[PDB]
Amino acid sequence: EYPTVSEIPVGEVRLYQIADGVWSHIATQSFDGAVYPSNGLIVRDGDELLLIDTAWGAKNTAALLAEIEKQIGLPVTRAVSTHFHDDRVGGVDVLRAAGVATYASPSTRRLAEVEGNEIPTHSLEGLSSSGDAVRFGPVELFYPGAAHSTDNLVVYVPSASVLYGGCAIYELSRTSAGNVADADLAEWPTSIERIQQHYPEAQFVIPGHGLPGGLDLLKHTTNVVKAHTNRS
């Protein structure tokens, strides 16, 4: 049911409808010669769409906009990037040229600039302290604390009980740590516990890469992060 690398042509994007007005978007990308899938989210709000994260680069993001027009046919008016890495912001310029208002926290914008990645235009206020939550239309944005990155945000869709964990949450298939160069390993389990405490009612949990699951993805991620922490 859920799209994988085998089903996605190079530079193409698939959508997966989760609920009334809620989809994930799935793209693929090469990195160090391996191919990775990558997820984002789309949430309807009246006659417009809210986009969470790019599709990991300009080509994929242009394909994402074309796939949204084909399958949904409503305009994307705002986008939020959930951390500063290129799988979340690469493609922001494509969104901006299409008239989308791009958003990220001030931390994400600063880190993207330092890295040389695309920088969302607008700033999301009220998210600088661990445990902060703000409404953003049909979703709630939550800063759980440092984890995969210091700036990582999670997104909850209350009407559908969908928790989008982004790259702070691993799919079950990933049993060893991914890119931890920008991570706070010491804080990552605590940050996950804040997610569990804030959204214990979540039914569908979306990792940044790979297959959705339930709240067991939070325990899974903690297990993997702790095992990496204990590498010897």
Round to the nearest angstrom and report the end-to-end CA distance of the chain.
39
The Cα 138–Cα 221 span in angstroms is 27
Smallest separation, CB 221 to Zn ion (Å): 13
Residue 109 contacts Zn ion per CB under 5 A:
no
For residues 217 and 27, what is the distance between their CA atoms, to the nearest angstrom? Answer: 21
Q: Is 59 in the site for Zn ion (CB under 5 A)?
A: no
Q: Examine residue 101 and tell whether it contacts Zn ion (CB under 5 A).
A: yes
Contact (CB, 8 A) for 24 and 51:
no
For Zn ion, the binding residue among 145, 208, 210, 212 (CB under 5 A) is 208
Nearer to Zn ion, 138 or 210 (CB): 210
Report the nearest approach of Zn ion to the CB of residue 89 (Å).
10
Phi, psi of 27 (to 5 degrees): -135, 175
Please pick, among 85, 117, 151, 152, the residue that the annotation labels catalytic: 85
User: Which C-beta is closer to Zn ion: that of 96 or that of 198?
Assistant: 96
**What count of other Cβ atoms lies within 10 Å of the Cβ of residue 98?**
13
How distant is the alpha carbon of residue 107 from its chain centre? Answer: 16
Which residues, 148 to 207, sit near Zn ion by CB under 5 A? 167
Q: Which residues are catalytic?
A: 83, 85, 87, 148, 179
Question: Which residues form the interface with Zn ion (CB under 5 A)?
Answer: 85, 87, 101, 167, 208
